Amino acid sequence: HWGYGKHNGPEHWHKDFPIAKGERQSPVDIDTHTAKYDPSLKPLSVSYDQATSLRILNNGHAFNVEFDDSQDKAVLKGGPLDGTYRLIQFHFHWGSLDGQGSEHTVDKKKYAAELHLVHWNTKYGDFGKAVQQPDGLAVLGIFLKVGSAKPGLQKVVDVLDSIKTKGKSADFTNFDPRGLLPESLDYWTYPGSLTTPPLLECVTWIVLKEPISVSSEQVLKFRKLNFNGEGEPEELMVDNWRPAQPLKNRQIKASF
Ligand SMILES: NS(=O)(=O)c1nc2ccc(O)cc2s1
Ligand SMILES: NS(=O)(=O)c1nc2ccc(O)cc2s1
Ligand SMILES: [Zn+2]
C-alpha cells in the first residue's frame, strides 16, 4: 500500500520500510563540483546487441519493459563494476510537469523524467539473491529532457494505451534498448539503493551525464497512464519519483 500520494508517498515509506532512513539511500543530488574524476574507473561496456525484450507491464508504480535474463544476452560491465550484470528490466520515473520528474538531480536541477535500466550481478545467480548483496545490482540512469522526439522511444509510447491500468501487460518483443541511450557514456557513480520499496541497499548507480531528449508529446503519453486498476477511479500516473536522500558517508565519482 505504499505509493506516491500524500497519504502513502515517500514521507510515509519509513514506517514499513525502515531502511528508508538508511546510510546509502537513493536517489541523491549530484553536486557536480564535489564529484571527483576517478582514473581508476575502467571503460564502461553496455553490451545490448542480443537483448531479448518480452513484455511490458503496468505495475501500479511505473511500467516495466521486461527482458529474458535466463542467459547473458544483454549485460553491463566495466566502469566501477566487478563482473557481469545482466539486464532484467527498464522503467521510468516522470512528473506531472516538465520541471520535475527525475529522481537524481544535478546541482539540484530536476529533469522531466529518468530512465532506469536495471541489472543484476550474475555471480549471485538470480535477482532475488542479488538483492541480498551490497553489490547485487547495477542501475544505469539516464535523464530525459523535453525537446526533440527520441525515435527509439516511440514504440514504448505507442503501446502504453494497451497497458493503461495497474496489472495490465502486453507482448513487447524485439525492442532494442540501445535506442534509448545518449551519444556519450560519461557518468557519475555512487553506492546506493532501490528508489522504491523495499529500498534495498544493493545498487551501484551509474548515472549518465548526457540527457536524452524526448518530445512533449511523448512524455504527455506517459502521463496518461493510471496508477489505479481497471474500473477504478482515475488517478493519473504522474510524479512517481522519490526525492533526493541524504548523501551521508558517500562520495560520487566521475568518469570524465
Ligand atoms: N508505509 S507505507 O508502506 O508507505 C504505507 N502503507 C500504508 C497502508 C495503508 C495506508 O492507509 C497508508 C499506508 S502508507
Ligand atoms: N527505481 S529502481 O531503483 O530502479 C528499482 N526499484 C525497485 C524496487 C523493487 C524491484 O523489484 C525492482 C526495483 S528497480
Ligand atoms: Zn527506478
Side-chain angles (χ1 to χ4, degrees), residues 39-41 43-78:
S40 89
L41 293 164
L44 188 72
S45 172
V46 180
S47 298
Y48 287 166
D49 188 67
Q50 304 247 96
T52 299
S53 65
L54 292 177
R55 189 173 82 136
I56 185 170
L57 170 67
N58 177 336
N59 61 24
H61 310 294
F63 63 86
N64 290 348
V65 173
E66 305 164 344
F67 290 81
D68 171 24
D69 61 344
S70 72
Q71 294 195 87
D72 277 341
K73 275 163 185 214
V75 307
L76 186 68
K77 306 179 16 87

Side-chain angles (χ1 to χ4, degrees), residues 2-5 7-41 43-154 156-160 162-227:
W2 68 268
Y4 294 97
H7 304 295
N8 63 357
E11 287 306 352
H12 299 274
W13 293 352
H14 71 101
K15 291 176 285 157
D16 289 88
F17 305 97
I19 200 66
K21 284 167 191 287
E23 297 305 308
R24 64 169 273 196
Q25 289 289 290
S26 295
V28 303
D29 180 56
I30 300 166
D31 196 84
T32 69
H33 292 108
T34 305
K36 193 193 166 174
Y37 172 65
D38 189 351
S40 89
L41 293 164
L44 188 72
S45 172
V46 180
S47 298
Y48 287 166
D49 188 67
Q50 304 247 96
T52 299
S53 65
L54 292 177
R55 189 173 82 136
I56 185 170
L57 170 67
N58 177 336
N59 61 24
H61 310 294
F63 63 86
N64 290 348
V65 173
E66 305 164 344
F67 290 81
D68 171 24
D69 61 344
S70 72
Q71 294 195 87
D72 277 341
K73 275 163 185 214
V75 307
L76 186 68
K77 306 179 16 87
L81 306 166
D82 180 23
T84 296
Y85 289 70
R86 200 166 289 174
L87 181 64
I88 178 170
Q89 52 111 321
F90 65 77
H91 62 274
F92 304 78
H93 307 264
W94 58 95
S96 53
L97 304 161
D98 296 348
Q100 56 194 226
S102 66
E103 294 209 307
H104 294 90
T105 55
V106 180
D107 295 332
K108 298 287 171 83
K109 179 196 169 71
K110 296 171 163 75
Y111 289 83
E114 189 172 326
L115 165 59
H116 289 161
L117 294 122
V118 183
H119 314 73
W120 56 271
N121 188 335
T122 61
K123 77 194 265 246
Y124 303 120
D126 62 41
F127 181 93
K129 285 298 215 106
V131 302
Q132 298 179 59
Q133 315 304 328
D135 61 348
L137 297 181
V139 181
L140 179 58
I142 305 179
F143 295 123
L144 281 61
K145 65 175 265 277
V146 169
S148 62
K150 187 66 164 180
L153 180 61
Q154 189 57 38
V156 176
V157 163
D158 282 324
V159 77
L160 299 183
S162 79
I163 58 151
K164 178 175 174 184
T165 53
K166 182 170 40 169
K168 290 194 121 67
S169 67
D171 185 278
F172 201 69
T173 49
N174 304 107
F175 180 77
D176 192 335
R178 296 181 288 191
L180 300 173
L181 313 179
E183 285 179 1
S184 197
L185 299 180
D186 287 353
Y187 61 89
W188 296 286
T189 179
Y190 76 100
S193 72
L194 305 170
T195 68
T196 71
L199 298 171
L200 299 172
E201 290 178 339
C202 289
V203 185
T204 300
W205 279 97
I206 302 165
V207 179
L208 299 192
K209 176 179 199 199
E210 187 171 13
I212 56 164
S213 297
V214 301
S215 68
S216 182
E217 294 80 0
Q218 291 175 320
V219 68
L220 278 162
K221 286 174 178 212
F222 285 18
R223 303 182 181 134
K224 296 190 172 84
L225 290 160
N226 287 187
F227 286 122

